[PDB]
Design a protein around this ligand. Structure first.
Ligand code: ZN
Lengths: 50, 261, 48
RNA sequence: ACACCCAGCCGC
């Protein structure tokens, strides 16, 4: 049972190019941003007390 | 970064795949190279609760400011599509809106007012200006509010816009009135000559532009009524009669060399 | 054509409609020697 | 200067 989630490095989920200034990230990077956002929300809501 | 050669630029060879020195040919570096999600609808029925609702849906938080910018861009696109503007003006409008919204000075006014004001600014800056009434036709906002918002945008964002001339509106007015090229050239010449010779001190360029339309219209086979001119220009028929009765003396001088009267 | 001799088998000759297809060999020839590589895995890239 | 998706086509 996982209680810490190992984030992969930038080699596993690198940023791609387009025209240039985009610097689009991998799908793992976007989902991990979502993971960190939901985890931070839960971690604050633990003592905020909903 | 070539050894034995300080301050040497490296030619990057995207075909050979290396970074190569134009004095000795060494290679530095062995090879060259080159946020959210949506939860959709469930396929299987195993995700449905006893009351349905599938228990897994997109929370769509995405801040407040990003929501405001997205709604504003939607309003800009659906506003500019009505008068059929090219997308370069739309993108310039979005650029001005983002600069204004990040300038943080116009929170006290409706976002739609800043939106239509940025549309007017972008239409001005491309050399194809629209009148205020044309923007007001495709916007839910009065002319007073758009005027005040335009005044506050020019005061706040610190930019200069070119003063309008009559010749910018002539092509749109004639083409939307379905008039040929000779009428276009004659009306533009009449408008520019009336501006430069000084018959119209302080008169609005929109009134004398529609006056030049009426000049070119009431001299050929096709003729346009005052009501049609006011419909296509937005100026009232009294303003057209004011410009008519003030432009009527010295008529052949305003005309071009040949028109086929 | 080389020796000028008669061919002792009478060749079937005549006009026939031929068509040149899109596939020319200069549009297909392709070679590599340690060229560019991908970002994700450092393998060589795909396609001519 | 990409990365997915789609389509068409080549040889067996
Ligand atoms: Zn060198």
């Amino acid at each position: 049972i996982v209680t810490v989630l190992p984030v992969p490095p930038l080699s596993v989920r690198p940023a791609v190019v387009m025209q240039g200034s985009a610097r689009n990230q991998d799908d793992l990077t976007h989902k991990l941003a979502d993971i960190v956002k939901i985890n931070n929300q839960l971690r604050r809501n633990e003592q905020n007390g909903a | 970064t070539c050894p034995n050669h300080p301050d040497a630029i490296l030619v990057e060879d995207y075909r050979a795949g290396d970074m190569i020195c134009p004095e000795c040919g060494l290679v530095v570096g062995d090879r060259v190279i080159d946020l959210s999600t949506m939860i959709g609808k469930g396929t299987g029925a195993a995700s449905f609760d006893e009351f349905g609702n599938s228990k897994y849906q997109n929370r769509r938080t995405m801040s407040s400011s990003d929501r405001a910018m997205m709604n504003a861009f939607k309003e800009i696109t659906t506003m500019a599509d009505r008068i059929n503007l090219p997308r370069n003006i739309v993108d310039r409008t979005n650029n001005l809106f983002k600069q204004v919204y990040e300038q943080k000075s116009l929170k006290g006014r409706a976002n739609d007012a800043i939106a239509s004001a940025c549309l007017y600014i972008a239409c001005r800056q491309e050399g194809v200006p629209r009148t205020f009434k044309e923007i007001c036709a495709v916007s839910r906002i009065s002319k007073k509010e758009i005027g005040r918002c335009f005044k506050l945008i020019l005061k706040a964002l610190e930019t200069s816009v070119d003063l309008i001339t009559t010749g910018d509106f002539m092509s749109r007015f004639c083409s939307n009135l379905c008039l040929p090229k000779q009428v276009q050239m004659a009306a533009t010449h009449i408008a520019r000559k009336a501006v430069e010779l000084d018959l119209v001190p302080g008169r609005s360029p929109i009134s004398v532009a529609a006056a030049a339309i009426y000049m070119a219209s009431q001299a050929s086979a096709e003729k346009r009524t005052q009501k049609e001119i006011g419909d296509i220009a937005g100026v009232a028929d009294v303003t057209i009669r004011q410009s008519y009765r003030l432009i009527y003396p010295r008529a052949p001088d305003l005309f071009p060399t040949d028109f086929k009267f | 054509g080389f020796t000028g001799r008669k061919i002792t088998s009478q060749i079937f000759i005549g006009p026939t409609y031929y068509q040149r297809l899109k596939h020319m060999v200069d549009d297909k020839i392709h070679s590599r020697a340690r060229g560019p590589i991908q970002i994700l895995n450092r393998q060589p890239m795909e396609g001519r």
